[PDB]
């Protein structure tokens, strides 16, 4: 198994896109924090996988640096991937960031750190068919960018996951991957494109 994604080396990120790169990472983390509470997890300072405690379920500004850069790099690689495919990212609607409210969840979503997930309310954002094929294609690539970095840290396949060896049952080709995870990647990058549009960006191939 060889996870080779679209080559992101012959690509640079213009400084005017660094703004979305920062906000895109925030929203992607907000969506993660919500889904994690939605499935048995809570806040903690000493991670114990059996107790469902997590230190990363905090606001984007309070994250540790090791996990933080990974969220900014993956966000930067996502933008660069669109550029490597021949698509452009450009601001057109200047009032969209002001007309971008955030989702507010029930009271039970607040934990012992003062953090309560508040992703952007992007439910009223519609995508054209061409942008759907992009999100589906971007999703398969996000699996490869994740799998390549893990592989060089020694991560291979293993029936049981493990935070102390390089084992993970999802280190497999996108075809041999459970459709739940495949759909999860598509949903994540569907909001990624909606995050751009929510800030006033038009995605358009050259
Ligand atoms: N599938 C995904 N899509 C977008 N961001 C993800 C992600 N998985 C993890 N992240 C980001 O990674 C950061 C936390 O890193 P961590 O190592 O704790 O992942 P994790 O605990 O979710 C492993 P798993 O999801 O398999 O149980 C989180 O703040 C989150 O934003
Ligand atoms: O088990 C798994 C896990 N995984 N992806 C995990 C990685 C970890 C960090 C992120 C990440 C993605 C996108 C952005 N972004 O664009 O901002 C920011 C961070 O995904 C996968 O494919 N199968």
Swiss-Prot record:
Spans of the sequence repeats? Answer: 1-105, 106-206
Q: In which tissues is it expressed?
A: Brain, skeletal muscle, placenta and possibly liver and kidney. In brain, highest levels are found in the cerebellum, hippocampus, caudate nucleus and amygdala, with lower levels in the corpus callosum, substantia nigra and thalamus.
In the UniProt entry, the disease listed is:
Congenital myopathy 20: An autosomal recessive neuromuscular disorder characterized by variable manifestations. Some patients have congenital limb or distal contractures manifesting soon after birth, while others develop muscle weakness with difficulty running and climbing stairs in early childhood. Additional features may include facial dysmorphism, and delayed development with intellectual disability. Skeletal muscle biopsy may show variation in fiber size with type 1 fiber predominance and atrophy, hypertrophic type 2 fibers, and abundant nemaline bodies.
Please describe the quaternary structure of this protein.
Homotetramer. Heterotetramer with RYR2. Interacts with CALM. Interacts with FKBP1A. Interacts with SELENON.
Domain statement:
The calcium release channel activity resides in the C-terminal region while the remaining part of the protein resides in the cytoplasm.
State what this protein does.
Cytosolic calcium-activated calcium channel that mediates the release of Ca(2+) from the sarcoplasmic reticulum into the cytoplasm in muscle and thereby plays a role in triggering muscle contraction. May regulate Ca(2+) release by other calcium channels. Calcium channel that mediates Ca(2+)-induced Ca(2+) release from the endoplasmic reticulum in non-muscle cells. Contributes to cellular calcium ion homeostasis. Plays a role in cellular calcium signaling.
Q: What is this protein called?
A: Ryanodine receptor 3
What species does this protein belong to? Homo sapiens (Human)
Shown residues in whole-protein numbering = 849 to 1054 of 4870
